[PDB]
Amino acid sequence: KPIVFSGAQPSGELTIGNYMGALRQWVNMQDDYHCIYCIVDQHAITVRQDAQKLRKATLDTLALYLACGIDPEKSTIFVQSHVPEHAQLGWALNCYTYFGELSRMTAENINAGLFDYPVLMAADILLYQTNLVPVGEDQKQHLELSRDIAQRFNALYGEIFKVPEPFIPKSARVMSLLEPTKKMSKSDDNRNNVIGLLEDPKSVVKKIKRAVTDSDEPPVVRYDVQNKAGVSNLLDILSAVTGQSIPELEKQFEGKMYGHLKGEVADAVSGMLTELQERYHRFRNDEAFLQQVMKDGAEKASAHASRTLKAVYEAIGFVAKRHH
Amino acid sequence: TKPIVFSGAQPSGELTIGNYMGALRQWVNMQDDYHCIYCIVDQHAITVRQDAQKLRKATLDTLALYLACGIDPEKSTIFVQSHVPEHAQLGWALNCYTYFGELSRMTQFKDKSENINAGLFDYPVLMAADILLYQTNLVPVGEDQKQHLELSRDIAQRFNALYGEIFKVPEPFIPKSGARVMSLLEPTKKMSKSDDNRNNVIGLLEDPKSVVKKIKRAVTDSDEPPVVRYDVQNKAGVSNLLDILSAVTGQSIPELEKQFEGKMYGHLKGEVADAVSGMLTELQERYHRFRNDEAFLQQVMKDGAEKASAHASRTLKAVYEAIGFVAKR
Ligand SMILES: Nc1ncnc2c1ncn2[C@@H]1O[C@H](COP(=O)(O)OC(=O)[C@@H](N)Cc2c[nH]c3ccccc23)[C@@H](O)[C@H]1O
Ligand SMILES: COc1ccc2nc[nH]c2c1
């Protein structure tokens, strides 16, 4: 099976765009690939965090990924800081990364971590002999650096690393509720644009009801991204939840207004979210289960990570560690 | 418990008399008075590109040389940096509490700057992690590491202010003489352990006969008559020789100045060559005994890494608890 590596930020509150797009897709491909999910708490501290919130957010992220359907028996899920090999390889790879490359990544009051984290990101991927990396547009420059580091290192010492590839195929279109041209992003400043995975029925209704549509006369529920971005976004969201086709939904809403569309979308999204929240709260409230998931995952990751690091360390020419 | 001493040296190039006077000499003398931990910093060495076989050999060379200088494994903890994962772990964490401007302003980074890698830029942060891991009180180094040591104090204070008494704020221990030994043919420049011109340097593993010839050819000055007195502006070479003689013998500069009244640079150089040649002969005798005893070197690295890991993990656990990571179970 090809190895897939995904970094999960313990800070990003996931939206329905994250779930119905990328996540639900990957939950269904756990028997096709050897998937690795890394909760990146060492990346998170590049921005200053409240200590207690970061600890909570780490566990919130673990429970939500399990709630979405990540299976710790099939996939490997773990906390980044629990595996020392990431930092160990991170430093080694600093020495085979040009300063110019990090300065070219798109002044003196910035912390060194925020400047230097793309090297740790490269080490995260290269530790596990990774074949595929699903990235957004924003993470593409980081993957190229990881690929350039791997090729540069292999040219000097032989075939130590796999040169990773991006996962090209896309999933599910979910746009922002008040700016349907812009995609629904977890990083969005305005939260009225997004529907979080842990939102209750009343909060979704309020946000869906206020979603921008259009001033067509008569009002007509038809798919058209150019001219009816808002109405089209609501149909896409409804299609993603229920599995019904857009033309099937256009037939369903024939002679119906936007208020009735918005009601069916709110009803459907909350039906999906309520099952996901049952799972979330059940996993999140069981500390013994979360501890056992983290131990097994870190144990799995560390076994594989140490094999690569030992080869990296042997190649560079360090004296081998004495054990007992 | 005793206050803690930590220091380290790179296994790259070949250690000089400069490295001995500014650091190793103080390391040997501190062993009973304080709890001493000394480290071979192979992770710092790879910031400059090494041959793989040369790096492995240089690590074991450096270990043997510590032992030959008088670093006793029964008194001090001696280990290889890469054998303790906690150095890289804390190093990353301290990156997030170090400003970019602090690293870009570094003298040592600018001088070292074809292969300008991120490790060379990020060098002082890992050095801070080396020191702060062991609750270090004193750091015996040469003058050229003063700026690096300032940053690890700043980092320690900055972190402690936010999270409490996690680190000790370390203090430099720079010697009165031999803190900055200068090049023999270029006494305005520091003696390096990777100088292209080898005649600038007195290697610790260099043939004493060859070392005596380098001292004889060391540049002095055009003063008429020749006078042996300390003056780094106008008499850099003579001052460097007086400084070397002071540090080997333990005698002060004014003591030596009186001793050389009415004498010239032939007497000065004869004394320096004699004192240094005798020290390196004895040092190299002990060296080959330790260096060829692989089982002894294997046991020192094992015991040292074990002692280091126990202490380093105590500090890292508290750092990780403070910053808000979920603890490893
Ligand atoms: N010409 C000279 N005259 C007098 N002293 C000198 C001369 N050249 C070097 N030194 C001193 O020798 C020690 C080793 O330096 P390295 O370059 O091996 O290695 C270095 O420059 C350190 N960054 C290694 C290190 C890494 N982590 C640490 C933590 C604590 C202390 C030291 C370290 C140093 O103390 C240095 O000040
Ligand atoms: C890029 O990752 C790393 C890893 C360990 C480190 N220690 C100091 N800087 C570091 C950077």
UniProtKB/Swiss-Prot annotation, chain B:
Instruction: Give the residues the record marks as binding ATP.
Output: 10-12, 18-19, 142-144, 181, 190-194
Question: What are the UniProt keywords, alphabetically?
Answer: Aminoacyl-tRNA synthetase, ATP-binding, Cytoplasm, Ligase, Nucleotide-binding, Protein biosynthesis
Q: Which reaction does it catalyse?
A: tRNA(Trp) + L-tryptophan + ATP = L-tryptophyl-tRNA(Trp) + AMP + diphosphate + H(+)
Q: Which organism is it from?
A: Escherichia coli (strain K12)
Name of the protein in its database record: Tryptophan--tRNA ligase
Summarize the subunit comment: Homodimer.
Q: Does the keyword ATP-binding apply?
A: yes
Can you tell me which residues bind L-tryptophan? 130
At which positions is motif 'HIGH' region?
11-19
Which Gene Ontology cellular component terms are annotated? cytosol
